[PDB]
């Protein structure tokens, strides 16, 4: 019965981390930004509304240019709109029309999606001939696509229903480098802004942070009592933002191993479907299924706005590079640009 | 607007127009859901109507079907039911021939994943097209092994008739919000030859069904 | 992506030609289709425009109402209707490919043209220089005017620069005023603001030798500039 004695060690370095997370924890993170001026209520208003998805939109993501923004809808269509002008740049059509993730290369020559087909499909946005084509699929999750981005044209980062991560050579189409380690269905990723590491959160309630090259999990966080559907790091990469099932949001700090506030409301019971951050990182921008966008002080857990406006679930949700705006996706077909 | 500017607005507004002609046409196609054990028949079923998830496409009379199999997610299935939630109904396959069988008892099994998709939230108004497969394979089992194996409380007959009513109530007890929804329980092995008329006559059902109730009818 | 034209040759002054432009290669239905002359000895003259899927057409005013163009979407053609052909219509006209979205590098591909020997409040851009001497490995800056400002409101400065390399149609090098057009070496770039602008080659090989036209794409009527010739 080695079993047991493996089990008794597992469980002795779970203590044993438990107690190291303890020990570090000399004072909370409301404590210290007590006296920080509390950004008292922003009042973001809907500047674009984004028309022309038939479906549900389940996944939004930003250029970096931070003018064009790829969408997905179960439509079928992979929309690139601009912003500025609220126009259709380009409606990919979609082999499968489950998707349920889209991201946006950093270099705006591509954009991934990904859903029920298990496949990350990439397509050429730029073509000698005038059409998006599917440059690649990337094959090989066995459970549905939930999250895809971006490292660099050929390098992608992509979370899946099987409970794995995997790096993909795009060029190649074979998967450079496979993150397992979750045991629930993982469902959000973010790169950290130097790309060498990533977060992904999963159904497991843990939240990992993998090296990309390594192809390890440096650390597990479990805070949240529910699935994580949405993560997002702080803007300096040394912490990130979880949205769960529990109504709850909580900031994990990479160098502390633990979780430093939850930016949870009483008034709140439904899941949070995406969370982003501002450019400075103070707001923490998180869609519910409650229809609406809470923006939360980041620094305070305080509920400085709220971004009412979709008529159902909003799905997702991205801050632009220069942080000028946020638009928010929605089950209810519609994409709205708030600032 | 400059002139690149309203040569941009211009294909914009074309991408709107084939985005609502594709609209158009996708409002056109009965979606069914497609669901099972895998070994329930499933398979056979799709073959009548004609990894990932598959999506299997068919006319009858007139109305085009979409039907999409998620039965090779393997995946937890709350994180995904929901992006079915428009379908217009369920089309739930069982192999009768798997009460005395084991994966738990497999009808045990069947029975629990019917329970929580007809009841799941996202399907309270979905009416469920309940394909009972193997029903000759029911029979050559039935003739020897009895159904008390998956149903202690059965206490009847071990003919194929009374024993295959008594599944089809056990499935349709399962039913909750039994006012909201209505289960199209059809008996098939592999050459009926009917369950496409019989997908249509309950699709069609549906469809009368949902127009009356928006006139107040039903 | 090629673009081939049809048509053209020798005309009897008040006749008619249809001008055919078999596209391949590329989505054609997707850009929009220009016409853009040049007379024998002369510089590059836009003459009529159709948008993609016909629904915006512009004509040059030397050419409007005498001209009529169309295309073939299913055949992926395009068609320059010509009638009572001047001595003015003596020109080689080419069909050029032009993209409009956000971010799109119009006229980036120009057909190869068929010459048309017809028997016997616009912006200006104005190039006075031409036929500079260029020696290889050495840089050059081409100059160019405009009589209006070409930076829209919207941030945009709709300059656009094309190198005619002798016995070939005209290619971009840069297509919104400091952009370079795929293809096209990192050595070209592109500068100015308002109505002034240069064109900069860093290095200049024996490839760079041409004729480089300014253009206007800010209104349409779409006008050139008189080409800077280069020569060793």
């Known amino acids: 019965s080695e079993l047991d004695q493996l089990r008794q060690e597992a469980e002795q370095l779970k203590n044993q981390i438990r107690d190291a997370r303890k020990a570090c924890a000399d004072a909370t993170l409301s404590q210290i930004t007590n006296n920080i001026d509390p950004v008292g209520r922003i009042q973001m208003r809907t500047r674009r509304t984004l028309r022309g998805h038939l479906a549900k939109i389940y996944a939004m993501h930003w250029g970096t240019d931070s003018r064009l923004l790829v969408s997905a809808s179960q439509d079928g269509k992979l929309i690139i709109w601009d912003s500025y002008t609220t126009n259709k740049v380009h409606a990919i059509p979609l082999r499968s029309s489950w998707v349920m993730t889209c991201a946006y290369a950093p270099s705006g020559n591509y954009v991934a999606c990904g859903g029920l087909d298990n496949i990350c499909s990439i397509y050429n946005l730029k073509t000698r001939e005038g059409n998006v084509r599917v440059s690649r699929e990337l094959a090989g999750h066995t459970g549905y696509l939930s999250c895809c981005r971006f490292l660099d044209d050929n390098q992608i980062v992509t979370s899946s229903g099987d409970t794995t991560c995997a790096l993909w050579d795009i060029e190649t189409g074979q998967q450079t480098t496979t993150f397992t380690g979750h045991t629930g269905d993982v469902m959000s990723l973010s790169l950290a802004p130097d790309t060498r590491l990533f977060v992904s959160g999963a159904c497991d309630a843990s939240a990992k942070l993998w090296d990309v090259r390594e192809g390890m999990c440096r650390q597990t966080f479990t805070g949240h009592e529910s699935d994580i559907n949405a993560i997002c790091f702080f803007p300096n990469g040394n912490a990130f933002a979880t949205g769960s099932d529990d109504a709850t949001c909580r900031l994990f700090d990479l160098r502390a191993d633990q979780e430093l506030m939850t930016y949870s409301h009483d008034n709140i019971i439904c899941g949070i479907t995406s969370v982003s951050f501002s450019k400075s990182g103070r707001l923490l921008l998180a869609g519910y299924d409650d229809f609406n966008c809470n923006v939360w002080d980041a620094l305070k857990a305080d509920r400085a706005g709220v971004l009412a406006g979709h008529d159902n679930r909003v799905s997702c949700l991205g801050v632009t590079d220069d942080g000028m705006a946020v638009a928010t996706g929605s089950w209810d077909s519609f994409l709205k640009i708030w600032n | 607007l400059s002139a690149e500017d309203k040569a941009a607005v211009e294909r914009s507004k074309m991408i709107d127009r084939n985005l609502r002609e594709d609209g158009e046409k996708a409002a056109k196609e009965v979606k069914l859901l497609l669901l099972g054990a895998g070994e329930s028949g499933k398979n056979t079923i799709v073959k009548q109507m004609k990894t990932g998830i598959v999506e299997t496409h068919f006319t009858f009379k007139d109305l085009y079907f979409k039907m999409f199999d998620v039965g090779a997610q393997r995946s937890e299935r709350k994180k995904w039911i929901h992006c079915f939630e428009g379908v217009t109904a369920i089309i739930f396959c069982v192999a009768l021939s798997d009460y005395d069988l084991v994966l738990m008892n497999r009808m045990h099994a069947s029975m629990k994943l019917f329970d929580s998709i007809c009841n799941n939230k996202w399907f309270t108004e979905t009416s469920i097209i309940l394909f009972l497969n193997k029903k000759d394979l029911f029979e050559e089992k039935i003739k020897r092994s009895p159904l008390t194996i998956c149903y202690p409380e059965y206490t009847g007959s071990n003919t194929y008739e009374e024993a295959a009513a008594y599944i089809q109530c056990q499935f349709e007890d399962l039913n909750r919000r039994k006012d909201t929804k209505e289960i199209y329980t059809h008996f098939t092995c592999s050459t009926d030859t009917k369950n496409v008329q019989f997908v249509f006559d309950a699709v069609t059902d549906v469809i009368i069904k949902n127009n009356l109730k928006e006139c107040g009818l039903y | 992506v090629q673009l081939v034209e049809s048509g053209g040759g020798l005309v009897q002054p008040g006749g008619s030609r249809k001008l055919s432009c078999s596209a391949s290669?590329?989505?054609?239905?997707?850009?929009?289709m220009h016409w853009v002359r040049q007379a024998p000895e002369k510089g590059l003259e836009w003459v009529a425009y159709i948008s993609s899927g016909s629904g915006t057409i512009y004509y040059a005013d030397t050419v409007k109402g005498r001209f009529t163009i169309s295309r073939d979407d299913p055949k992926n053609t395009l068609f320059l209707q010509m009638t009572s052909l001047r001595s003015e219509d003596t020109a080689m006209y080419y069909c050029v490919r032009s993209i409009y979205y956000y971010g799109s590098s119009p006229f980036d591909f120009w057909g190869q043209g068929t010459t048309l020997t017809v028997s016997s409040s616009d912006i200006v851009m104005t190039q006075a220089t031409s036929s500079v001497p260029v020696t290889p490995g050495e840089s050059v800056s081409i100059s160019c005017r405009s009589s209006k400002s070409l930076l829209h409101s919207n941030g945009n400065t709709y300059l656009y620069w094309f190198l005619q390399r002798p016995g070939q149609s005209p290619q971009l090098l840069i297509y919104?005023?400091?952009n370079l057009a795929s293809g096209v070496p990192d050595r070209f770039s592109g500068s100015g603001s308002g109505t002034a602008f240069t064109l900069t080659i860093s290095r200049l090989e024996a490839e760079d030798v041409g004729v480089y036209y300014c253009?206007?794409?800010?209104?349409?009527?779409?006008?050139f500039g008189a080409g800077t010739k280069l020569e060793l």
């Open positions: 290669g590329f989505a054609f239905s997707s850009f929009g």
């Open positions: 919104r005023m400091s």
């Open positions: 253009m206007q794409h800010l209104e349409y009527p779409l006008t």
